[PDB]
Amino acid sequence: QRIRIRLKAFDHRLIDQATAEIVETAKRTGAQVRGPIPLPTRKERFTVLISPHVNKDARDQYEIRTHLRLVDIVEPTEKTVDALMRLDLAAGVDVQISL
Amino acid sequence: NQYYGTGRRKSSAARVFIKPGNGKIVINQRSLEQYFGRETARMVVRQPLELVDMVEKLDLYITVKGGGISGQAGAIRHGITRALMEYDESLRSELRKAGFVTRDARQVERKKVGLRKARRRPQFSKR
Amino acid sequence: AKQSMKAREVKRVALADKYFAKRAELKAIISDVNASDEDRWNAVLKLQTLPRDSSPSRQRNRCRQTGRPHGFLRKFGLSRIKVREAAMRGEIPGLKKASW
Amino acid sequence: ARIAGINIPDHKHAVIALTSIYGVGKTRSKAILAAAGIAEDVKISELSEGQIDTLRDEVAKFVVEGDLRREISMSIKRLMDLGCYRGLRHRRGLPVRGQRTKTNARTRKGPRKP
Amino acid sequence: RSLKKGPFIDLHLLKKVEKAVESGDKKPLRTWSRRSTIFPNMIGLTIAVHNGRQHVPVFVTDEMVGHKLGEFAPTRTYR
Amino acid sequence: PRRRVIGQRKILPDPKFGSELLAKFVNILMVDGKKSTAESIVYSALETLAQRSGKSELEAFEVALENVRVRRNALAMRWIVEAARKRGDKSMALRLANELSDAAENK
RNA sequence: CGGUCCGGCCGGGAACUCAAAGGAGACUGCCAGUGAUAAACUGGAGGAAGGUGGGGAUGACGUCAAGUCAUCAUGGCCCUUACGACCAGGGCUACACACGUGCUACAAUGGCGCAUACAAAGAGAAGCGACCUCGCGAGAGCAAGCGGACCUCAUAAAGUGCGUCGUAGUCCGGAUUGGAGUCUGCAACUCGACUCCAUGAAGUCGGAAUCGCUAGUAAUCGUGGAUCAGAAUGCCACGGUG
Numbered sequence: 001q002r003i004r005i006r007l008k009a010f011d012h013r014l015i016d017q018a019t020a021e022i023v024e025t026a027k028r029t030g031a032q033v034r035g036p037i038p039l040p041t042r043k044e045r046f047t048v049l050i051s052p053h054v055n056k057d058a059r060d061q062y063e064i065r066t067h068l069r070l071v072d073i074v075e076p077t078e079k080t081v082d083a084l085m086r087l088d089l090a091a092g093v094d095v096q097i098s099l
Numbered sequence: 100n101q102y103y104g105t106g107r108r109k110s111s112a113a114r115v116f117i118k119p120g121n122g123k124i125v126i127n128q129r130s131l132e133q134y135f136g137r138e139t140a141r142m143v144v145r146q147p148l149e150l151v152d153m154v155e156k157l158d159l160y161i162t163v164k165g166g167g168i169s170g171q172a173g174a175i176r177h178g179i180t181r182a183l184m185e186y187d188e189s190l191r192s193e194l195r196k197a198g199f200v201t202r203d204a205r206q207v208e209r210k211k212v213g214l215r216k217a218r219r220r221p222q223f224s225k226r
Numbered sequence: 227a228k229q230s231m232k233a234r235e236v237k238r239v240a241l242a243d244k245y246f247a248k249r250a251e252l253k254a255i256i257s258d259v260n261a262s263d264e265d266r267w268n269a270v271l272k273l274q275t276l277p278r279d280s281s282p283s284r285q286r287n288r289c290r291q292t293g294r295p296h297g298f299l300r301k302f303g304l305s306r307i308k309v310r311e312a313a314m315r316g317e318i319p320g321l322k323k324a325s326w
Numbered sequence: 327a328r329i330a331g332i333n334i335p336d337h338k339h340a341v342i343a344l345t346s347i348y349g350v351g352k353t354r355s356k357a358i359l360a361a362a363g364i365a366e367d368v369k370i371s372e373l374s375e376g377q378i379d380t381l382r383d384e385v386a387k388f389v390v391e392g393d394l395r396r397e398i399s400m401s402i403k404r405l406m407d408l409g410c411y412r413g414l415r416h417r418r419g420l421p422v423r424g425q426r427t428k429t430n431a432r433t434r435k436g437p438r439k440p
Numbered sequence: 441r442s443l444k445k446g447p448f449i450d451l452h453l454l455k456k457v458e459k460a461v462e463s464g465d466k467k468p469l470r471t472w473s474r475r476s477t478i479f480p481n482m483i484g485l486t487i488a489v490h491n492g493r494q495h496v497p498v499f500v501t502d503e504m505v506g507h508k509l510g511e512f513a514p515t516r517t518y519r
Numbered sequence: 520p521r522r523r524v525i526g527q528r529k530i531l532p533d534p535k536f537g538s539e540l541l542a543k544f545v546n547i548l549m550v551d552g553k554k555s556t557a558e559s560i561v562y563s564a565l566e567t568l569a570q571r572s573g574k575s576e577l578e579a580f581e582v583a584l585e586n587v588r589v590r591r592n593a594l595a596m597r598w599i600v601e602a603a604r605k606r607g608d609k610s611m612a613l614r615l616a617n618e619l620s621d622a623a624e625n626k
Numbered sequence: 627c628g629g630u631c632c633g634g635c636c637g638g639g640a641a642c643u644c645a646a647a648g649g650a651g652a653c654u655g656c657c658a659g660u661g662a663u664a665a666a667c668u669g670g671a672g673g674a675a676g677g678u679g680g681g682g683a684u685g686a687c688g689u690c691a692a693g694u695c696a697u698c699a700u701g702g703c704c705c706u707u708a709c710g711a712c713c714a715g716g717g718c719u720a721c722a723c724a725c726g727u728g729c730u731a732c733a734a735u736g737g738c739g740c741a742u743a744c745a746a747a748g749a750g751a752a753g754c755g756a757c758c759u760c761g762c763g764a765g766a767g768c769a770a771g772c773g774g775a776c777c778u779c780a781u782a783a784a785g786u787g788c789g790u791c792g793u794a795g796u797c798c799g800g801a802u803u804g805g806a807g808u809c810u811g812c813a814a815c816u817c818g819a820c821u822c823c824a825u826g827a828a829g830u831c832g833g834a835a836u837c838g839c840u841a842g843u844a845a846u847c848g849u850g851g852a853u854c855a856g857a858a859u860g861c862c863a864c865g866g867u868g
């Protein structure tokens with residue numbers, strides 16, 4: 001079989017901290033992982049008015065950066081599964097598992 | 100022996116693969132005359148191979164994605180110059196003199212708030 | 227907006243999942259079926275007796291905190307001015323001023 | 327070459343010369359030449375009389391003459407004599423199908439005069 | 441404009457037609473359905489079409505079949 | 520211009536003939552960024568001037584350029600193109616070819 | 627490199643392009659002249675980039691009782707079987723005119739027809755919706771894939787190649803109008819979008835006056851998104867040629 005973990009977060013310096021802890025734990029217990037791959041960032045952009053009335057020209061410029069990380073695990077070792085499945089990760093990281 | 104050089108433009112990206120000896124040009128599994136519909140686009144890639152003489156002397160195998168007519172052609176023209184510097188390494192002084200190794204980094208100016216275009220302002224009243 | 231105007235919108239949503247969620251969903255299909263009941267489906271006449279305020283076209287997406295019917299965003303459910311007030315005080319995660 | 331459409335077509339290509347008939351545009355002129363068997367770039371020269379009257383037979387299915395002028399007009403007479411809202415728009419020269427009347431109604435209203 | 445799968449008519453106005461055909465012609469019928477399509481079973485009756493503030497009676501004619509009742513009520517007074 | 524005194528940009532020359540001056544000529548006729556349709560008109564106009572109106576195509580344009588004289592060459596090329604549009608012939612290649620024939624014979 | 631059903635499609639390859647986490651690199655650093663030996667300027671080399679490289683964010687004290695009690699927050703006042711509240715329809719879209727802001731034009735640097743090449747950036751689950759089939763078409767039916775670098779919107783348009791029209795109110799331009807239809811939605815009359823047939827106004831480059839912009843800019847070409855059941859010539863972004 002093959003399990004993969006899709007990781008998404010808002011902060012780029014926070015997504016790689018949660019990514020490296022999974023890969024280091026996997027290499028220590030003897031699992032085969034072909035590293036993490038950087039997926040293209042799906043970034044939204046929001047341009048809305050700052051004024052409630054006339055002077056239309058002054059606006060705000062927002063963005064929402066959503067990075068993506070994927071870790072591919074080849075062998076479903078029981079020592080690998082039992083360790084990674086209940087890790088204590090960052091609150092700003094959403095996990096997606098495909099068993 | 101292969102000699103590689105990366106050249107690109109606004110949204111293009113082109114690879115250059117050099118093999119010694121032919122006058123063959125293969126771009127995206129097509130010919131030089133078949134792919135380039137513009138006659139100017141055929142000649143601008145011949146511009147870096149003007150000071151350095153090529154007739155039937157080296158292969159070039161190129162692919163390119165993105166951009167347009169001259170955006171792909173400018174990507175090839177940059178990529179050949181880095182390949183010849185990889186090929187001979189003494190040819191740099193002639194390439195610096197022509198100005199082809201300088202990557203054209205003039206990108207598009209962003210669309211501004213309050214204006215319909217990058218610098219074009221909507222029409223103005225005096226009083 | 228006015229408090230009575232937001233009471234209208236809650237009344238429309240409460241009828242929206244009530245009547246037109248699944249019942250008008252069926253009545254939209256039976257009028258659309260090409261295979262059977264090509265002439266006498268009569269689902270149009272039964273749709274007339276249903277109340278109007280269940281309609282998804284009649285409801286208006288408004289700001290959940292103020293009730294402004296203008297400048298709506300489906301990303302947060304707020305008006306354009308209330309997006310700034312939570313962003314400057316750090317109440318919306320990841321939202322900040324952009325430069326490109 | 328005089329058709330049942332008595333107004334004389336110009337001495338040019340076939341699909342252009344059929345456009346001069348009131349009620350035959352570019353699309354319908356393609357359909358007549360396709361049903362006849364005449365190429366669209368054939369001029370009035372060498373277009374023999376055996377090829378003119380076979381264009382009269384294909385155009386005979388449609389009413390394209392002053393008889394078409396009255397049927398457009400009497401259809402408007404149906405609206406005006408009935409007294410409908412759409413009939414009131416044609417009598418004063420106002421737009422019908424939802425064009426605005428604040429400004430930019432110059433085709434309907436006629437030339438300006440304060 | 442409207443699709444061919446069913447010309448629209450309101451339910452309350454359709455009931456007012458059915459009693460009027462059987463029980464004979466009456467006083468002009470006050471209604472608000474400016475969106476209904478005229479059917480051939482209404483020829484002869486007088487239907488008062490509401491125009492914003494009043495009711496204008498419309499004597500139904502044979503060639504009115506297919507049009508709307510809102511096309512017989514001017515909504516503004518022009519001077 | 521008051522303080523910022525800078526030079527003028529040096530465009531790449533004509534890829535067909537290797538002429539710096541002819542590259543500034545096609546940009547005047549070019550509208551809406553259409554380079555590919557502009558040089559097709561200019562090349563077809565000069566071949567009419569070369570084959571049926573006098574050999575030495577590069578020299579034949581210069582004789583037409585000399586009578587109507589950086590800025591001196593710029594105003595000379597602009598007067599040829601703008602007067603060619605308001606003519607009676609059919610295409611732009613035929614109109615600009617007759618302007619160079621008239622400018623070579625200074626009329 | 628093997629494999630050919632000529633599709634990266636399949637074994638595989640980790641080179642390269644792309645994708646994004648970190649880092650190097652440009653600092654008048656080096657040389658020459660000018661300048662009071664200064665700051666600096668000028669010229670040249672090196673370099674992908676050289677004189678704040680390109681763009682953005684970043685906008686002092688104050689000025690106009692400039693704009694916002696109709697985003698919201700807030701002192702007071704006023705009404706309260708009514709200045710409140712419910713619903714139907716109408717109006718906000720009217721029409722003798724005026725002003726400002728836009729689009730498409732007046733065309734052979736084009737129009738139309740056939741064949742055909744190259745984008746970047748986004749959106750998608752009460753959603754995007756392929757393929758197949760049908761209709762001239764707007765679409766409809768059948769029905770996968772996809773919470774997505776996989777699948778869909780989605781064939782980018784200008785351009786290129788040929789043919790045609792030959793300078794005219796025209797195969798220019800499409801206004802207006804009639805007829806016949808499509809989709810959305812309780813519901814398209816007032817007042818929707820789009821397609822098909824037909825009609826083919828004004829207009830042949832625009833007075834005084836007035837505006838934008840010093841380079842990937844102007845000009846022009848289409849694409850996408852927000853708002854939205856539906857309703858973009860506006861606004862926001864994105865690239866193509868230049």
Ligand SMILES: [Mg+2]
Binds near residue numbers: 227
């Ligand atoms: Mg309040």
Ligand SMILES: [Mg+2]
Binds near residue numbers: 283284285
């Ligand atoms: Mg609505």
Ligand SMILES: [Mg+2]
Binds near residue numbers: 345348
């Ligand atoms: Mg005609």
Ligand SMILES: [Mg+2]
């Ligand atoms: Mg970096």
Ligand SMILES: [Mg+2]
């Ligand atoms: Mg004031």
Ligand SMILES: [Mg+2]
């Ligand atoms: Mg036309």
Ligand SMILES: [Mg+2]
């Ligand atoms: Mg400036």
